């Protein structure tokens, strides 16, 4: 045999990245099958910096009309806040593409340093939900010293 049916998927979120101004480099996350690791590590950060989101996904399907961004902010097995990033319509023709969030404050504080596992659902208007996975984001005072 030479094949076993791939199940070639329309959008899925390809890999996550996280860049800002004073951060030790954009964090990236793999986001095809290799998730479990995502509870096994966190993502450390400072007292609420101002940091952006790449998203990336593959479309060599259906055009997807509606595409968004959903994140629980879970903290402690406790849901504090969620939102959803509307990303924007995707055609299939040659690979996947680069969503970017403007820079999100984290949650600062004295008691806000610590893991924070968060919910994303990559979903689209309605017709289904693409993926979703969770990771914990470790708040600190000077992750870049």
Same mark, same amino acid.
């Given at each position: 045999?030479?094949?076993?049916?791939?199940?070639?998927?329309?959008?899925?979120?390809?890999?996550?990245?996280?860049?800002?101004?004073?951060?030790?480099?954009?964090?990236?996350?793999? +986001? !095809?099958?290799?998730? =479990?690791?995502? $509870?096994?590590?966190?993502?450390?950060?400072?007292?609420?910096?101002?940091? &952006?989101?790449?998203?990336?996904?593959?479309?060599?399907?259906?055009?997807?009309?509606?595409?968004?961004?959903?994140?629980?902010?879970?903290?402690?097995?406790?849901?504090?806040?969620?939102?959803?990033?509307?990303?924007?319509?995707?055609?299939?023709?040659?690979?996947?593409?680069?969503? +970017? !969030?403007?820079?999100? =404050?984290?949650? $600062?504080?004295?008691?806000?340093?610590?893991?924070?596992?968060?919910?994303? &659902?990559?979903?689209?208007?309605?017709?289904?939900?693409?993926?979703?996975?969770?990771?914990?984001?470790?708040?600190?005072?000077?992750?870049?010293?």
């Amino acid at each position: 045999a030479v094949s076993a049916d791939p199940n070639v998927p329309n959008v899925v979120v390809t890999r996550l990245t996280l860049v800002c101004s004073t951060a030790p480099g954009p964090l990236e996350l793999d +986001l !095809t099958g290799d998730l =479990e690791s995502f $509870k096994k590590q966190s993502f450390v950060l400072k007292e609420g910096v101002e940091y &952006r989101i790449k998203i990336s996904f593959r479309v060599n399907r259906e055009i997807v009309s509606g595409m968004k961004y959903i994140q629980h902010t879970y903290r402690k097995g406790v849901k504090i806040d969620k939102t959803d990033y509307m990303v924007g319509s995707y055609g299939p023709r040659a690979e996947e593409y680069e969503f +970017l !969030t403007p820079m999100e =404050e984290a949650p $600062k504080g004295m008691l806000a340093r610590g893991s924070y596992n968060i919910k994303s &659902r990559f979903t689209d208007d309605d017709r289904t939900d693409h993926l979703s996975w969770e990771w914990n984001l470790t708040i600190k005072k000077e992750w870049k010293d």
